[PDB]
Each structure stands twice: as C-alpha cells, then as structure tokens.
Amino acid sequence: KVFGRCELAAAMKRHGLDNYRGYSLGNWVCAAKFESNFNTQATNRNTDGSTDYGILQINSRWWCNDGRTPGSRNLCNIPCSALLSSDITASVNCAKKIVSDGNGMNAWVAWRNRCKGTDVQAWIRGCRL
Ligand SMILES: [Cl-]
Numbered sequence: 001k002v003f004g005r006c007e008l009a010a011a012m013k014r015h016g017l018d019n020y021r022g023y024s025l026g027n028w029v030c031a032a033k034f035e036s037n038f039n040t041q042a043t044n045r046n047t048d049g050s051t052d053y054g055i056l057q058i059n060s061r062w063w064c065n066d067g068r069t070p071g072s073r074n075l076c077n078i079p080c081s082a083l084l085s086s087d088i089t090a091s092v093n094c095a096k097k098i099v100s101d102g103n104g105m106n107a108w109v110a111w112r113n114r115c116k117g118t119d120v121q122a123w124i125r126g127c128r129l
C-alpha cells in the first residue's frame with residue numbers, strides 16, 4: 001500500500017507514534033517519505049546480506065525474521081513480511097522498540113541525513129489530525 005502523506009500521519013498518530021520518545025509526528029512522516037516513499041511493500045537489500053522492510057525500512061539483522069540473514073536476531077518477534085502489510089501496526093510497534101534502543105531516530109540513516117534539523121512540521125501541514 002502506498003499511503004497518502006496525511007493518511008500516514010493519521011495512522012501513525014492513532015498508533016501512538018506522535019511525540020513517541022520525544023519525536024514529533026512530522027519526524028516520523030519525514031522518515032517514512034525518504035525510507036519508503038510511504039510504500040509499505042518497499043524492501044531493500046543491504047551490503048551485509050540483511051534486508052530492510054516496509055514504510056520505515058526495518059532491518060532483518062536485529063528486528064525481524066526473514067529466514068535468510070545468518071546470525072540475525074528477531075527482536076520484534078515477527079516475520080519481516082509482517083512489515084509489508086497495508087496495516088502498519090507491526091511496523092509502528094517495532095519502530096517503537098528501535099527508537100527506544102539508545103540512539104533515538106538516528107537509527108534511521110535517512111532521518112539523520114534528510115530530516116534531522118529540518119522543519120519537519122512541514123510534513124504534516126494541511127493535515128486534519
Ligand atoms: Cl511535527
């Protein structure tokens with residue numbers, strides 16, 4: 001599913017991501033835009049053999065099982081394919097664990113390089129939330 005911008009903002013809010021660990025909703029929308037273009041089906045292989053999955057490109061080396069990432073962990077207790085669903089519940093729940101890991105949203109490379117320090121409120125302007 002390719003979300004609309006305000007459609008994703010509403011879903012993230014409802015799932016309790018707005019201001020989660022101090023990150024305002026626009027941070028999460030901005031992260032999703034550059035990680036996945038708001039496309040839940042996005043997948044991307046990494047050089048180490050792991051794969052990133054879903055709207056927030058969550059990686060199989062620590063967070064989900066995809067059956068082909070040796071020595072990996074599954075800290076969100078889920079198949080990586082669950083992160084590809086039109087329903088973003090699993091992605092949001094797992095992102096809450098990742099962002100609580102110690103580095104906050106610096107865990108998302110695209111957030112650090114394209115969102116951090118910018119006017120991320122712009123990502124939710126116009127939205128009825
Ligand atoms: Cl914001």
Ligand SMILES: [Cl-]
Binds near residue numbers: 021022103104105
């Ligand atoms: Cl933080």
Ligand code: NA
Binds near residue numbers: 061062063069072
């Ligand atoms: Na894994």
